[PDB]
Design an enzyme around this catalytic site. Structure first.
Site, mmCIF file in Angstrom:
data_model
loop_
_atom_site.group_PDB
_atom_site.id
_atom_site.type_symbol
_atom_site.label_atom_id
_atom_site.label_comp_id
_atom_site.label_asym_id
_atom_site.label_seq_id
_atom_site.Cartn_x
_atom_site.Cartn_y
_atom_site.Cartn_z
ATOM 1 N N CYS A 150 80.836 29.838 61.885
ATOM 2 C CA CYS A 150 81.153 30.121 63.306
ATOM 3 C C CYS A 150 82.244 31.192 63.393
ATOM 4 O O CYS A 150 83.125 31.290 62.519
ATOM 5 C CB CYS A 150 81.514 28.879 64.102
ATOM 6 S SG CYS A 150 80.201 27.631 64.063
ATOM 7 N N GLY A 178 80.866 26.561 58.664
ATOM 8 C CA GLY A 178 82.047 27.429 58.512
ATOM 9 C C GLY A 178 81.765 28.864 58.918
ATOM 10 O O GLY A 178 82.713 29.680 58.916
ATOM 11 N N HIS A 180 85.690 26.201 69.998
ATOM 12 C CA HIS A 180 85.497 24.880 69.346
ATOM 13 C C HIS A 180 86.298 24.804 68.042
ATOM 14 O O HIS A 180 86.244 23.751 67.400
ATOM 15 C CB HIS A 180 84.032 24.458 69.233
ATOM 16 C CG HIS A 180 83.263 25.034 68.104
ATOM 17 N ND1 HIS A 180 82.276 25.972 68.295
ATOM 18 C CD2 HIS A 180 83.287 24.767 66.782
ATOM 19 C CE1 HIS A 180 81.752 26.294 67.128
ATOM 20 N NE2 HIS A 180 82.361 25.571 66.182
#
Lengths: 306, 306
Positions: B145, B143, B41
């Site tokens: 991830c 942030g 993503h």
């Protein structure tokens, strides 16, 4: 979101751990530039520890009696001196992995990470608080002495703690990196009273602010209080007295949430008087005091290191 | 002695974290040999995340559209592919700090350390459990991830988790390092049900053994039980059913303490039925399920890494 008891990333400290052996005692040292720092009780047997004369025991030791091993490299000891309760072994190589660092004496109620080590090798990292009675509630087995506690500020490691002793009560005592014990403790195997301990009020309030930010709000009540009124309750429940300095440190969390500090005090007062009624706050069934206001802001705003 | 929720030393993983940017999305990657692993993503905007076609979005991207930064060094991307929900960016340099490592898919109830990162920089380390419903209760802001979970076995890092999603309920979902989600989750911003969660019974029993080893004994009672009888109680309180496999894993802790596993089950049954009556166990006012039997043995025996 979410809120965890997070330790600092340990890599900068892992590169500084070494093994120190003197006669048949092995524990951990901290190698910074060309000095290795370790508990002076490395020179004692179990029997010496009952009533040690550190000056007389150290006189019997020469540079070549200290074996210092950094992973597989033996370091050459070229000097030794005692500073309070620490030994400083001068070695002939500067640690190539020395980080930017300072030595700090922290205040009761401040937090830090411990890198637990055995034989100079790291086993784990955890976050804890210096208790108001200058003990810590750690996880330390035989051989963990010389393990250190620290904070990080971007690229700089502030070393604040070196582990020396388990008291007969099973809590833990140690020094700053100048070898000065926190609290009344000595490096002798004898009965040693820790003070009455207290709860770190400013930390509990910080953690209630963390809870509100995360959506855990059930404990917010209809009341306010005064600093003097709250402190009467703090006395009864063995909480540290709250000062204006503490109110001021909570200012930013008050601002973010729109909950006046004295309103949050009234919520805490009701939890002290009524308990939690089988409920939880941030997954805890007791009031947590191991997060400073600075810890909550750091975690809630994602501050990083390097 | 003492017992803490200890994370693994993070240094071997710190050396693998990098920043990945695609258009205006930045998150973390893991650099091992000449591959950087990150959540697919990274190719989505906030708007894309509502209903992404990953194949169509990825076709619009070329090698030069992925910016990979390791501290200050930009890496050169020479290949990209999607594996399930992860992107693998081939780069032209092998990470000089690559540790011995494996990719592992862990079982529900197993534990691991998370190195929380932002913009490719570490902020903190904490230990958690994979819930029986394949969520984790982490600390993850915008942030985070691409942050990873891992275990260490002496010098080998077993990577088991990569962070992808916060569910609307505020718990956390992610993948193994082959990009396969734990549980029923997808990398889409939509309502997603987590199962009913349950308590990890074999972990609670491990932690009761840790308590006894540390001297916390008040909860030991006069009763025994059967596996079937205990499991009737486990059902009522939403605890995982205990199997003989679980009994067998607890064998060494049973042996060390001289408390038969079914006797410890009867103690747990009484705590489930009667509560803790305002008492604590290893400083907790609830039954802790984030330590595996292997975690308790490790901590109680001072196992180290390198």
């Amino acid at each position: 979101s979410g809120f965890r008891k997070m330790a600092f990333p340990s890599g900068k400290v892992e590169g500084c751990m070494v093994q120190v052996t003197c006669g048949t005692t092995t524990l951990n040292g901290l190698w910074l530039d060309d000095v290795v720092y370790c508990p002076r009780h490395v020179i004692c047997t179990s029997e010496d520890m009952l009533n040690p004369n550190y000056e007389d025991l150290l006189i019997r030791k020469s540079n070549h009696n200290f074996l210092v091993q950094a992973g597989n490299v033996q370091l050459r000891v070229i000097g030794h001196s005692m500073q309070n309760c620490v030994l400083k072994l001068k070695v002939d190589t500067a640690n190539p992995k020395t980080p930017k660092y300072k030595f700090v004496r922290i205040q009761p109620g401040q937090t830090f990470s411990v890198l637990a080590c055995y034989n100079g090798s790291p086993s784990g990292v955890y976050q804890c608080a210096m208790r108001p009675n200058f003990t810590i509630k750690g996880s330390f087995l035989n051989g963990s002495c010389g393990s250190v506690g620290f904070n990080i500020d971007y690229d700089c490691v502030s070393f604040c703690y070196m582990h020396h002793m388990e008291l007969p009560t099973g809590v833990h005592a140690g020094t700053d990196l100048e070898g000065n014990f926190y609290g009344p403790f000595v490096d002798r195997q004898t009965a040693q009273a820790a003070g009455t301990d207290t709860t770190i009020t400013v930390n509990v309030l910080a953690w209630l602010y963390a809870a509100v930010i995360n959506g855990d709000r059930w404990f917010l009540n209809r009341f306010t209080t005064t600093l003097n009124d709250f402190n009467l309750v703090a006395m009864k429940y063995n909480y540290e007295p709250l000062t204006q300095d503490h109110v001021d440190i909570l200012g930013p969390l008050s601002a973010q949430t729109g909950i006046a500090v004295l309103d949050m005090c009234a919520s805490l007062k009701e939890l002290l008087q009524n308990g939690m009624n089988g409920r939880t706050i941030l997954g805890s069934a007791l009031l947590e005091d191991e997060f400073t206001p600075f810890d909550v802001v750091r975690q809630c705003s994602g501050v990083t290191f390097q």
